[PDB]
Amino acid sequence: FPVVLVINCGSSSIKFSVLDVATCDVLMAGIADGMNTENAFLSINGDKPINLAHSNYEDALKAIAFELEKRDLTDSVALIGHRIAHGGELFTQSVIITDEIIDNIRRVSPLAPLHNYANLSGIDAARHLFPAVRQVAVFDTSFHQTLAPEAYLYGLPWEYFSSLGVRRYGFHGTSHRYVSRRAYELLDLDEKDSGLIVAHLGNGASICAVRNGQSVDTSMGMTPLEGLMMGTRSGDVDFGAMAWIAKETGQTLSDLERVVNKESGLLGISGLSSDLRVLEKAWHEGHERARLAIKTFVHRIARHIAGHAASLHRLDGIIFTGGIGENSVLIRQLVIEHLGVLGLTLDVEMNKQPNSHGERIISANPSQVICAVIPTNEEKMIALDAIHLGNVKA
Amino acid sequence: FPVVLVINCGSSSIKFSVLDVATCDVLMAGIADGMNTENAFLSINGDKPINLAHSNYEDALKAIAFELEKRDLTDSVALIGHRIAHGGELFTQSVIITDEIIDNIRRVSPLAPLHNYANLSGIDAARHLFPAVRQVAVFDTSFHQTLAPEAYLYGLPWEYFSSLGVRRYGFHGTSHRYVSRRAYELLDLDEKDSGLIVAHLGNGASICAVRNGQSVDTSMGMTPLEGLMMGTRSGDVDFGAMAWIAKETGQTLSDLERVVNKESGLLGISGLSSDLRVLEKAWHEGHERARLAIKTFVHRIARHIAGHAASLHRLDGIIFTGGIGENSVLIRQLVIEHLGVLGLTLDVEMNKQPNSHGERIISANPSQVICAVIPTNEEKMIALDAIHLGNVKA
C-alpha cells in the first residue's frame, strides 16, 4: 500500500502532505513554519507545535522524515513530488528529477528569486533523505506554456524578451490544469472541443482561459503580481501611476514593490483585512471601504473573466476554485451577476450550498454558459503526475 | 456666418482648426510645430512652413491670429474651444472658461504635467488675443467621470487615492463621447437603453464601455499609458516585471518611463516602426516580428473589448474609430475574428470599404452584435459644446 510524499517548500515554510497511491487520499499533512528564524516549529495535523528551533530546510525535512518513520510509513514512500514556483520556458510538463533538471531549475530561478531557491533547497534535502526514492518536479507555470506569443509577449523592447526572458508566464498552472481536467467530466465536455474559463480565487488569484484542453491566456504575468486584485497584492496597475507616485512620495521601486505586494489589494482598499470573511461581515455591518474593496475585487474578476473569454472560440464553462472560489457564495454571485452580458443565469440555492457538496453546477438551465464550483487539489494533481512518472524507465 | 476656433495646444505644437458654426465644417486647419525650439514654424493646410523661429506659445497663437485676420475671419470668431488633457475629478463636462476654471485646471495639472501646463499656456494666450470672445474648456477625461469606484479605484493603499488622487481617469473622452452619440443614430439605439464598446485606435489607443449613454469603463488609467498596447506605448505591464528589469539592467524609473512611452509598443516588438502601414507591408513581405507586433496589438484590443463588455447589461455594438480604427481593414477583421466568442460575424466587402464611406456598419446580419466604423470628430464635438455654451448668460 504505497504512498507519495508531496512537498511545497516555500521561503518561510515547508507545507507537506502524504497521499495514498491507490486512492490519492491524504493520510497525513503538516507544515514546518518559521524557517530560518530562531522560532521554528513543526505541526502535524495542527496538533503540537514541536521543537525545531533555529533549523535549516534540510533539518525541517529530516524532522518530517523521522515523523514519517514514527508512523511506520517511511518504507512505503514510493514517490516524492516537489512543487516548483517557476519553470521559465524550459519546463512544459512535470518531470523526473535528475541532475540535468536541477541545473535547469537553477537557470530559470532568477525569474523567481524568493520561491525557487527555497524549492531547490527542498529538492536537495529530499534527495539526501530519500535517495532510493523516485522524485518529480511539478511547475506552477508549465500549464501556461501553450500560450501564443501574442498572448505572452509584453509591449516592451523585443530585447527585453529575447535577452532577459521578460514575458507572461502565469501561475496556479497545477490548479487550472486539475480543475479543467475535472471540468470535462462534470460538464460532460469533449476536451478536444471545449472552452473554459477557470477563476482560481484564493491566496493569490488568477484567471485562465483553457481552449481545447490547452491554456491560451492567464491573468498573472512574469510575476504573480499581474492580473486580478488580491488579498495584499494590487493586481493590474498603470505604470504611469506607479512612476508618478515615486516622484511624489520620494519612494524607491523596492519601497513600491513592498507596497504593491504587502500593503495593497483587499487590505489596501479596506484598510482593515485581506480576509474576505472579515470584510464580508464588515460590509454587512455597514463599512463602506470594505464594500468598495469587495466590489472592486469582484469588478476586476469579471473584467478578466470576460477578457480571457476572447481567447476562446466558444464559452462552455466558468469554474470557480480555490479558498475564496470554493467557499464565497457572495463573491461568486456578484461576479456571475456582473457577467450577464455573457448570458449567465445563476441558481442561488445551488450557489448557496457549502463546499462540502464538492464538484457542483451553480447555474440555472436557461444559462447560456454553465457555471460550476470545483474544489482544487494541487497535491492530488502532483501525485497523479508522480504516479504516472513512476512507470518510466530512466 | 460665425465660426468657432478650436485649439489643441500641446507640449511641442499648437494644432488648430476653424469650424463654421452653421455646418460644423472645417474652413481652416493648421499646426505651429517646433515650439520652444529655435526651429519653429507655422503651416496652414500644409502649404508653407512659415517663419516663426524661437517663439513662445503666445507668439505662435498671435501668428495664427494674424493669419485669421488675413483671411477676413477674425471678426467672425464667436467662440474659442480649448482642448485640455486632464480634468481630475473637478470637471464632469465642458465649461465656459473663467478665472475659477483656470485655477481649477491649475490644481489638477500635476496629474498630467507635460500636457496641461501647455493647455494653460494656450488659454492665457487665446484670452489675451481674443478677450471679447467666449472661450470654452473641453477635457479629455470628463466623459469617464461617470465611472463607479469599483471601475476607477486601483488596488493600492486607500491613502494614495484620497490624499494623492491616484485613480483611473481615462482619455479620448471627447472621441468616445462623440462616436457613441453617433452610434445611437447609426444603429438606431435608444441612448437610455444601450451598451456600446468603442475602440478608439489611433495615436494613442483606448477602449470605452458606454452603458445607457454613460462611460462605465475605459482602458487607459491615471496616465494614458495603461490598457492597450500602442504605437510607442507598452500598455498593460506587470509591475513585477518592470521592477525586475530595473534590478537587472540597473535603470531608473525615469529611464523605464521613457522606454515604456517612447521605445515600446508596436515599435518595441517590431524593432521597425510604430506605423501600422509600414508593419502591415512588413508582414506581407514576411517579417515575423512585424507580424508578432500586429498579432499582439490585435490580441490585446480583443482582450479589453471583451473585458469592457462585462460592464454592460447588453452588448448592442462595437464601434471602431481613430486613424487606425477608421482605416485599417486588417486590424478590424483580426480583432472581430478574435471575438467570435461574442457571436460577431463580419461582412468583408463592407469591411473592405475605405474611410470615404464614413459612418458604416461592417457586420453581417447573422451577427449577434452590430459592428461599425464611425469616424471620430473631436473638433466638431468641441464646437458643438462651445455652440451650446454660447447660449448661456454668465
Domain with A41 in it: what CATH number?
A: 3.30.420.40
> Does residue A211 share a domain with residue A172?
no
Q: At what angle do helices A288-308 and A276-284 cross, to 10 degrees?
A: 120
Cβ contact (<8 Å) for A307 and B311?
no
**Would you say A227 is a known binding-site residue?**
no
In one-letter notation, the amino acid at residue A330 is L
Sign of the Cα torsion B332, B334, B339, B345 reads: positive
C-beta of residue B189 within 8 angstroms of C-beta of residue B181: no
Q: What is the Cα–Cα distance from A339 to A342, expressed in whole angstroms?
A: 6
- Of A23, A44, A20, A22, the C-alpha closest to A33 is A44
Q: What is the Cα–Cα distance from A317 to A310, expressed in whole angstroms?
A: 13
Q: Which of B150, B162, B289 to mutate to probe the A interface, most A CBs <10 Å?
A: B150
Q: Is B114 left (phi over 0), alpha (psi -120 to 50) or beta?
A: alpha
Q: What is the 3-state secondary structure (H, E, C) of chain A?
A: CCEEEEEECCCCCCEEEEEECCCCCEEEEEEEECCCCCCCEEEECCCCCCCCCCCCHHHHHHHHHHHHHHCCCCCCEEEEEEEECCCCCCCCCCEECCHHHHHHHHHHHHHCHHHHHHHHHHHHHHHHHCCCCEEEEEECCHHHHHCCHHHHCCCCCHHHHHCCCCCCCCCCHHHHHHHHHHHHHHCCCECCECEEEEEEECCCEEEEEEECCEEEEECCCCCCCCCCCCCCCCCCCCHHHHHHHHHHHCCCHHHHHHHHHHCCHHHHHHCCCCCHHHHHHHHHCCCHHHHHHHHHHHHHHHHHHHHHHHHCCCCCEEEEEHHHHHHCHHHHHHHHHCCHHHCCCECHHHHHCCHHHCCEECECCCCCCEEEECCCCHHHHHHHHHHHHHCCCC
Give the count of domains, chain A: 2
Vertex B83, ends B82 and B89: CA angle to 5°? 110
For residue B118, the SS3 value is: helix
**Would you say B280 is a known binding-site residue?**
no
Q: What is the Cα–Cα distance from B114 to A284, expressed in whole angstroms?
A: 44
Question: Cell numbers of A319, please?
Answer: 469554474
C-beta of residue A186 within 8 angstroms of C-beta of residue A372: yes
Q: Which residues of B are catalytic?
A: 140
Residue that is last in its domain, among B154, B188, B222: B188
Task: Order across the sheet with B214-218: list the strands.
Answer: B214-218, B205-211, B195-201, B317-321, B370-373, B360-361
Residue A312 to residues A58, A217, B169, Cα–Cα distance (Å): 45, 9, 30
Radius of gyration of chain A (CA): 21
- Of B188, B130, B228, B183, the C-alpha closest to B321 is B183
> Does residue B379 share a domain with residue B238?
yes
Residue A346 to residues A171, A198, B297, B306, B339, Cα–Cα distance (Å): 28, 17, 34, 21, 24
> Does residue A147 share a domain with residue A99?
yes
Q: Is B31 exposed, middle or buried (0-12, 13-18, 19+ CB in 10 A)?
A: buried
Pairing of strands A77-84, A205-211: unpaired
> Does residue A256 share a domain with residue A153?
no
Rounded to 5 degrees, what are φ and ψ at A8? -110, 100
Vertex A255, ends A252 and A259: CA angle to 5°? 135
Sign of the Cα torsion A259, A261, A263, A269 reads: positive
> Does residue B381 share a domain with residue B318?
yes
> Does residue A393 share a domain with residue A253?
yes
DSSP string, B296-343: HHHHHHHHHHHHHGGG-S---EEEEEHHHHHH-HHHHHHHHHTTGGGT
Residue from the list A150, A246, A313 with its beta carbon closest to the beta carbon of B296: A150
> Does residue B203 share a domain with residue B280?
yes
Cβ contact (<8 Å) for B313 and A340?
yes
Q: What is the Cα–Cα distance from B53 to B60, expressed in whole angstroms?
A: 9
Residue from the list A158, A240, A341 with its beta carbon closest to the beta carbon of B226: A240
Strand partners, A6: A17, A81
Which range marks the domain in which residue A327 is found? 189-394
Cβ contact (<8 Å) for B155 and A296?
yes
C-beta of residue B82 within 8 angstroms of C-beta of residue B383: no
Residue from the list B268, B299, B310 with its beta carbon closest to the beta carbon of A306: B310
Residues 6+ away with beta carbon under 8 Å from B201? B228, B301, B320, B321, B322, B323, B324, B325, B328, B331
**Would you say A200 is a known binding-site residue?**
yes
Vertex B10, ends B4 and B13: CA angle to 5°? 90
Radius of gyration of chain B (CA): 21
Question: Cell numbers of A36, please?
Answer: 530560518
> Does residue B196 share a domain with residue B57?
no
C-beta of residue A325 within 8 angstroms of C-beta of residue A344: no
Distance from CA of A239 to the nearest CA of B (A): 7
Residue that is last in its domain, among B188, B219, B252: B188
> Does residue A157 share a domain with residue A247?
no
How many Cβ atoms sit within 10 Å of the Cβ of residue B323? 17
Query: What long-range pairs does B68-77 form, CB within 8 A, spacing at least 24?
Result: B68/B5, B68/B18, B68/B28, B71/B28, B73/B3, B73/B18, B73/B27, B73/B28, B76/B1, B76/B2, B76/B3, B77/B2, B77/B3, B77/B4, B77/B5, B77/B18, B77/B130, B77/B133
CB-facing half-sphere around the CA of B285: CA atoms within 13 A: 9
A229: chain B residues, CB-CB within 8 Å: 155
C-beta of residue A305 within 8 angstroms of C-beta of residue A200: no
Residues 6+ away with beta carbon under 8 Å from B348? B333
Interchain contact B116–A (C-beta under 8 A): no
Solved using? X-ray
Question: Cell numbers of A387, please?
Answer: 504516479
> Does residue A321 share a domain with residue A257?
yes
B243: chain A residues, CB-CB within 8 Å: 223, 253, 256-257
**Would you say B323 is a known binding-site residue?**
yes
Q: What is the Cα–Cα distance from B165 to B149, expressed in whole angstroms?
A: 13
**Would you say A83 is a known binding-site residue?**
yes
- Partner A, chain B 259-288, Cβ-Cβ below 8 Å: 259-260, 263-266, 268-271
Could you identify the residue written with the cell 514654424? B41
Could you identify the residue written with the cell 473554459? A196
Could you identify the residue written with the cell 509598443? B265
What is the C-alpha end-to-end distance of chain A, expressed in Å? 24
C-beta of residue A328 within 8 angstroms of C-beta of residue A335: no
Q: What is the Cα–Cα distance from A258 to A223, expressed in whole angstroms?
A: 14
Question: Cell numbers of B155, please?
Answer: 488596488
Strand partners, A5: A18, A80
Residue that is last in its domain, among A169, A188, A207: A188
- Strand (E) or helix (H) holding B236: none
Residue from the list A240, A264, A340 with its beta carbon closest to the beta carbon of B221: A240
Instruction: Please pick, among A20, A75, A140, A347, the residue that the annotation labels catalytic.
Output: A140
Pairing of strands B370-373, B195-201: unpaired
What b/e sequence results for A243-257 when a residue is b if at least 16 CB atoms lie within 10 Å of its CB, and e otherwise?
bbbbeeeebebeebb
Question: Cell numbers of A24, please?
Answer: 490519492
> Does residue A341 share a domain with residue A234?
yes
- Of A374, A369, A372, the C-alpha closest to A315 is A369
What b/e sequence results for B216-238 when a residue is b if at least 16 CB atoms lie within 10 Å of its CB, and e otherwise?
bbbbbbbbbbbbbbbbbbbbbbb
For residue B373, the SS3 value is: strand
Chain breaks of chain B after residues with C–N above 2.5 Å: none
Interchain contact B242–A (C-beta under 8 A): yes
Q: What is the Cα–Cα distance from B248 to A369, expressed in whole angstroms?
A: 45
DSSP string, B205-219: EEEEEEETTEEEEES
Interchain contact B244–A (C-beta under 8 A): yes
> Does residue B352 share a domain with residue B303?
yes
**Would you say B227 is a known binding-site residue?**
no
Residue A195 to residues A189, A200, B62, Cα–Cα distance (Å): 9, 16, 61
DSSP string, B147-186: --HHHH--SS-HHHHHTT--S---S-HHHHHHHHHHHHHH
Could you identify the residue written with the cell 449613454? B213
C-beta of residue A351 within 8 angstroms of C-beta of residue A362: yes
Distance from CA of B269 to the nearest CA of A (A): 5
Cβ contact (<8 Å) for B235 and A265?
no
Distance from CA of B155 to the nearest CA of A (A): 4
Residue from the list A221, A314, A338 with its beta carbon closest to the beta carbon of B241: A221
Q: What is the Cα–Cα distance from B319 to B308, expressed in whole angstroms?
A: 13
For chains A and B, what is the number of CB pairs under 8 angstroms?
Answer: 236
